[PDB]
Subunit: 388 residues, 4 copies
């Protein structure tokens, strides 16, 4: 069993074709399915699994009330083959209100975080045993990706952030080998707030499109040199911009260098990836709410500032439906390494208040160089059929 | 691990012996079992699984209401070992309101179709990753087999149809190798409407008995030359005829050449297979409704037009019970390749309206050269015990 | 992978130690557990499974009403690792209201029987495919063991009976190799009614202690010569006698030669096995009802007629509790082949009528040459907590 | 496959990092989860499982009433991968109201005990078959560890006690090889009552910190020489002391030699382990009730009597929450063998009487040489949401 060194061309995609959907909320109205959020998917060298931080409970359970809160000690990381809902027989792989998992080619690494917000711990579980651990360094909610990390030749990288959301914070880059933290590089380059990175390999390095929760609606980038642990940060060039809230295509800017200062603050976990001077990217269709989800390429979006020439658009979830977080995931082909993405379809609380709980389902699409049609694949549950 | 080249005599069967039954509807009145339809079964080189397109829900769930509709974005392809009902822990292998799956001897291919009816996409998933994709070519509900496809030496064939049900349409033949579409032959021969093919290998080729939803109650045939992608079509010779609705044994014809123009239009997925100049075939016992199911051989049924000399009849489901779709599936023995078949037992809506849902159970029998008795194995659920 | 030739001394046991219990009825009052009966257990070369013919339904389901009836088309053979209840995710391995399963050392053979009582079929499923089939030969409820069969060097033997319960019948002995019936020897020796045999290997042969449902309360024996298919029958010598109903230890006889003609007719599936001139045997403690269960050795019980000198008694289920069928099962050790037994604990209908259903749980003990104490392990369910 | 000889340094830990949590009680208010108690965890050479003696029932089941009682014949030993709750599909590996399981490196040994309290039997199950058995030797509730045992080079050791709780009793040490009891050493050294040992390897021996239910609040030690079966007993030196009830840190003593005679009698299963002249130990935070749970090192705690200089404290469960039993478990790293521990979080009856049942959830932490924060991870269920 060799290690994943991911040495292969990124496949030249033509768009995304539907891959999987789990129908959790729909199934939750007549079945014992966990309450989750902040989901993601990642595959070992043979198959894909789906993760999500449950809420230590089930939907049709009085305990689901007030599940809007992100961090309680009962959130553990769930893991099932892709396509199988989070039913009672699901393995809570670790305790965590934050996470990242990846397979170096020989085993699974899971970085789980629970604890006081002011003093939390991150355990590094690999191959079943707990190899290392680390503690909060800024005393203000130690956080990580909420999606897969990446390993090249045995050394995995996962970024983490401790500090203020709506403010300045401390972002670091962990290089771990076999569960053991072997180097921590801090953030460098022009980025002003790195949160929830969506990372993918670009041999010999790792690239991430993160979330600026402070001053940018445009997305930061993080370049990790695997060879020496050096790091560089920037922003996307596309004036198209992919964060919510955002300004709006016409009055939207990005110089790839600094936060755009347009509706900047908050955001949502999202992704994007390069292809030449181009960018493949997805965002909610709504710029105020996390509603609907669309994808499209942007000619120039990578290398040329404020470019807004978009082509190959696609709606994954129509605007009249709720979406949420989104990340990317890579998958090795016989000839190239293809990129895919998942979309969190959050329901219930804060927004919908008929019910007192909050959960979600997922939808995943994968890059294809084939052909495809049109559609819309939302959660699908009728809130008036749902418990509570 | 070699590839399945299926080079072996078709076993000389004497009839069919019971193989499996899942009791889904019965179990659904006190258990969380998915709502499905358009089922089928297929085996890898070691075991058999059962597929079905669920309805993104469970029976005892308010969401099962109005599940009579064939295509919503929540239909995904379910897959379990043969004999295990579709419970919450079932893996939705892909998103699809149409499908075909087959194992080349090294891995599983699944062709799933979801999307707009006017613009749908078909994803080609193999070995876990999404290798290819294709789009609607006639803009009118891209469709496929609803049963297993077949692979000879690494190249799998699955047929698909886009166009008008009750009208003329565009039928093509896909040859895919390792998830990658490697050639598309269009329809040839005398066939007027090819829908829902039931294909089986006849080394060095593949033979299908399909569904003419336009002008024939007799069933079309499709011959696929694996060696060169050439294709020929015909109709069955048996005046016995196997589609529903149909005329009736005495006033029923078939010249094996053209649609019989007798109650022709609509139909139902069915199967049949040759043995010399003979044909083994099954159809509902009812010629108006999909009620009951019988099988029998027809001396001459293959090679001699309008032959109606049937022998070895067998009732699988008595006429006082509902049946539905039906397909075939092959299984390699130590000496020959035996053919088997499954029967969809659809319940609920449109016909039975006490309940507002629609689902089904299955029953499967396999060819035997032994002896057997008599019986009847219907769904078994008491609609007055059922939810809704 | 070699074949099981079972060439090893029967371990010199000192009694039985508790092995497994599933708690089905208890679990059925708050969980979806199948309705079953006529259970049994058997192990492959690495682990043991538990079988039972379900009733195509769940206990807390309106469909469980009137489950007292033995043969409906919905009874299928369930199979799980030993210790895991028959929950929704259980695989119905085949359709059957009668059965026997055994592992030749390379694969599992399952003989399943469904169909008309007057015309039923028995399918021979091996390694996943249906290799053979046979039909009713006396037109009066084709039956088989209801427990494991045995294979020596690749040829498995399973006995079957068609004919009258309370009368004369046709009993045959099937020798099948790889699912294919390869010889049928008919019954020979002094036995008058062979039903529900409990067979175990005694290299180079197979020995069975069956059920005389016509004229004997003492149990028939069946000797199968694997080397030539010859067969001999007898009865047990023990005047202690193990069938229910029976006369009673003091006024009970057996000459090992003919049916005792004492409360003879009906009976229940049971077992016994030899050790020198001795016999290890179990029976219900009640001689009218299937209540409680006891085991004990009988000095002389094998070779000396009407012997009633019993030692090492043990109560498995106290007399104030219900039991039922019982069979034996062998398990290969590193030095000898040990024999074990299971007990069916049937509840509900006919006897208990608060509820309208009928099901059961199991308890299994294994031979030990160690020490042990005393106890009683009944079903445990409180009928007043149970559904219906 | 070699045997586990555990030849490696105990890792130099810096404290414990969160490892797993199952959320059983929380999940039990809307899901079918077994009623258990006296849990524990142990890993084979690749993964960890969690055990617990169920109560032959489910929480939302009328049968859970009066589950406060420790020994009924329906208690069987449950086993699932670590992180997966005890749902209906759980395998009851054996019948037992007492237990210990361990993996010699080639297979699992389970010592299960059921039977009369006055006359009980202990079955030795290994590799699936029941290899040996033993009977009560003092006729007064034969008992064992309630946690993992340890095997060095093929010979596993498990200690057991028969006799009076609140009195003098007979404690023995079993050395079993492949399920076969191969030597029984009786207790030696200064210990006055050994119950519920928490054992761990210290090559070439095994060390246990047990429970004195008679005259000590300080914990006994048991030294097992694997090389010759010799045995020595003592008490911990720490004046800090780890049993509940206990006196209180300031007025607490221990000379490592004799029971402290301070609130001595009853107790609770707990653990501790040495590191030089130091001791890592955990106890409830409450000295009257089993409430909350804390851990800390004690400088001198191993080798110097009445030492109370504690450092590196950590609260696992805050004092305002219930805890219970606790044991240790070892896990082999690539360089050293690390020790971990689990905590039973018992709820319901005797203490909380809103509900009539009694069950629990678990929390497990593992030794780390990294860093960590602060927190509290209790059961989490709201008793007013719970059934009954
Ligand atoms: C593959 O498949 C696409 C599917 O496209 C998308 O369609 C829907 C909207 O985006 C959406 O549910 C789904 O998620 C797909 O992303 C094929 O074409 C698609 O066709 C539809 C229908 O023609 C287009 O939808 C438009 O937007 C509104 C909602 O869909 C609708 O109100 C519009 O109404 C009027 O326009 C249509 C032309 O689109 C015309 O037929 C009528 O005159 C209609 O009349 C109205 O006039 C006023 C408002 O429009 C009102 O006062 C009056 O009441 C009435 O509403 C319009 O239909 C959709 O935008 C288009 N999508 C794409 C992607 O092209 C597409 O053919 C093919 N493309 C590819 C790349 O594969
Ligand atoms: C293996 O096992 C078969 C089983 O055959 C099938 O039987 C049932 C009908 O097909 C069905 O449930 C099951 O699915 C099987 O496919 C053995 O024989 C079978 O026997 C039955 C009973 O004799 C035959 O059934 C006939 O059809 C009606 C329903 O089953 C029934 O109404 C008929 O009634 C009269 O006929 C019987 C002769 O069949 C006779 O005993 C009586 O006189 C009875 O009297 C009536 O007279 C009028 C109508 O018939 C009425 O006015 C009056 O009220 C009363 O109803 C009839 O019984 C079945 O057709 C036959 N099947 C097969 C396959 O041969 C078979 O022996 C063996 N064969 C093989 C190849 O293995
Ligand atoms: C290992 O463990 C056994 C357990 O044996 C079995 O005990 C119970 C009955 O068989 C049963 O639940 C369980 O399934 C076991 O198979 C050890 O000994 C056992 O001890 C019990 C108690 O002494 C014996 O039971 C007898 O039968 C009745 C029910 O158990 C009970 O009513 C009897 O009552 C009188 O007898 C006892 C002596 O047994 C005496 O202590 C009292 O004087 C008591 O007084 C009565 O007098 C009249 C009726 O007896 C009434 O008018 C008045 O109200 C009152 O009831 C009796 O207790 C059981 O038979 C015996 N079993 C075995 C197997 O020996 C055993 O020590 C050890 N053996 C082995 C091989 O391991
Ligand atoms: C890593 O993270 C720890 C977390 O420590 C623990 O905190 C809580 C108590 O132990 C517990 O939920 C959790 O399980 C952890 O084990 C970091 O520090 C921790 O900080 C807290 C808050 O400062 C400490 O808690 C103390 O105890 C009570 C409950 O937590 C609380 O009532 C106390 O109140 C007063 O003290 C604080 C100082 O601790 C001060 O800010 C206020 O003045 C407050 O005012 C009160 O005055 C009177 C009573 O105190 C009342 O009349 C009036 O109403 C009001 O209550 C106090 O806060 C906790 O002990 C401390 N824990 C540790 C482990 O140090 C820690 O910084 C870091 N350490 C390590 C090794 O990683
Ligand atoms: C990933 O794996 C390859 C495996 O060797 C690393 O490249 C090796 O580089 C040395 C010089 O550093 C050559 O001798 C090896 O033989 C190289 N590979 C090959 C295929 O020849 C590579 O640097 C690793 N590190 C990273 C970040 O990708
Ligand atoms: C299926 O597999 C066989 C495997 O070789 C293909 O047949 C081969 O044909 C060539 C000439 O085309 C011979 O040299 C090979 O050695 C043949 N097989 C054997 C066993 O000798 C066959 O044509 C393949 N294609 C199809 C449709 O079946
Ligand atoms: C079970 O297996 C053995 C395997 O060979 C069979 O015994 C063989 O008998 C022949 C003569 O028939 C010897 O040459 C073989 O080498 C024998 N075995 C051994 C170990 O030498 C045996 O007869 C088989 N049949 C039955 C009923 O047990
Ligand atoms: C304990 O177990 C290990 C693993 O079986 C034994 O393995 C060998 O011993 C050393 C290093 O452990 C070398 O002699 C071999 O090449 C090792 N093989 C492996 C896999 O490590 C070791 O002999 C046993 N040690 C003791 C002290 O009993
Ligand atoms: C555990 O395993 C080792 C494996 O051999 C045992 O140690 C062996 O001791 C003999 C003398 O008794 C040496 O020749 C072996 O080669 C030793 N091991 C090594 C690695 O050399 C050891 O005693 C066993 N027993 C216990 C309690 O640990
Ligand atoms: C880690 C964590 O729980 N912080 C957090 C996160 N990650 C997400 C959200 C949110 O976008 O709703 C809100 C949050 O407070
Ligand atoms: C693919 C699809 O959903 N079309 C379709 C199919 N396949 C079957 C039926 C039907 O026979 O009820 C009806 C239909 O409309
Ligand atoms: C095979 C079958 O269903 N016959 C049968 C059997 N096997 C058992 C019993 C019974 O003992 O209740 C009763 C029966 O009628
Ligand atoms: C073995 C057993 O059931 N005895 C026992 C045990 N082990 C524990 C407790 C208890 O601490 O509640 C109480 C008990 O009576
Ligand atoms: Ca922002
Ligand atoms: Ca038609
Ligand atoms: Ca009888
Ligand atoms: Ca004590």
């Amino acid at each position: 069993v060799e290690y994943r060194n991911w040495s292969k061309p990124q496949c030249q995609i033509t768009g995304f074709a539907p891959f999987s959907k789990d129908n959790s909320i729909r199934l939750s109205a007549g079945g014992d399915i966990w309450v989750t959020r902040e989901p993601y998917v990642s595959c070992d060298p043979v198959k894909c699994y789906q993760f999500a931080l449950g809420q230590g409970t089930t939907l049709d359970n009085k305990h689901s009330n007030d599940t809007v809160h992100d961090r309680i000690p009962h959130r553990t990381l769930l893991m099932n083959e892709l396509g199988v809902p989070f039913h009672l027989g699901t393995r809570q792989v670790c305790i965590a209100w934050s996470s990242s998992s990846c397979h170096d080619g020989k085993a699974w690494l899971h970085v789980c975080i629970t604890g006081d917000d002011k003093n939390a711990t991150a355990s590094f579980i690999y191959d079943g045993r707990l190899v290392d651990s680390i503690g909060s360094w800024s005393q203000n909610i130690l956080r990580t990706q909420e999606s897969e990390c990446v390993c090249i030749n045995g050394t995995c990288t996962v970024v983490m952030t401790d500090g203020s959301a709506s403010g300045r914070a401390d972002t670091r880059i962990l290089f771990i080998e076999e569960g053991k933290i072997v180097h921590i590089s801090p953030l460098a380059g022009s980025a002003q707030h790195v949160e929830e990175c969506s990372c993918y390999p670009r041999y010999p390095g790792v690239r991430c499109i993160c979330r600026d929760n402070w001053k940018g609606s445009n997305r930061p980038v993080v370049d990790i040199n695997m060879e020496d642990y050096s790091i560089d940060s920037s922003y996307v060039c596309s004036g198209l911009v992919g964060d919510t809230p955002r300004n709006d295509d016409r009055s939207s800017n990005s110089n790839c260098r600094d936060p755009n200062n347009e509706r900047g603050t908050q955001g949502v976990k999202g992704w994007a990836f390069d292809n030449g001077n181009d960018l493949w990217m997805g965002r909610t269709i709504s710029k105020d709410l996390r509603s609907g989800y669309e994808t499209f390429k942007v000619i120039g979006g990578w290398s040329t500032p404020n470019s807004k020439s978009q082509i190959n658009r696609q709606v994954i979830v129509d605007s009249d439906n709720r979406s949420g977080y989104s990340g990317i995931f890579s998958v090795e082909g016989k000839s190239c390494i293809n990129r895919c993405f998942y979309v969190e379809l959050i329901r219930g609380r804060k927004q919908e208040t008929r019910v007192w709980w909050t959960s979600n389902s997922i939808v995943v699409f994968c890059g294809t160089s084939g052909t495809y049609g049109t559609g819309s694949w939302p959660d699908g549950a009728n809130i008036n059929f749902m418990p509570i």
